[PDB]
Amino acid sequence: DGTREFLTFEVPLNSAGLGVSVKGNADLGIFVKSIINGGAASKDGRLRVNDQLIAVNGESLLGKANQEAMETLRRSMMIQLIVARRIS
């Protein structure tokens, strides 16, 4: 899935969730599958499909497996996201 750069942004809420579906994937990571229109992520506009979720409010995922990572994400739900996004 090419070369990725790390980006961070804060996503405001209010109530409703982030408003995205995420999918796993040899185990790779958690990736944004879709962004639900009208949702907090959609309003904010910066998160994109195929972004890999790397960290949430300072809680890294990465080291984990898709199952554990997904858990950590749900647990961790204004959100500070760190994503990895392809340039190439």
Binding site: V20, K23, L73
Partner: peptide
């Protein structure tokens, strides 16, 4: 695919 799981909602968050």
């Amino acid at each position: 695919e799981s909602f968050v």
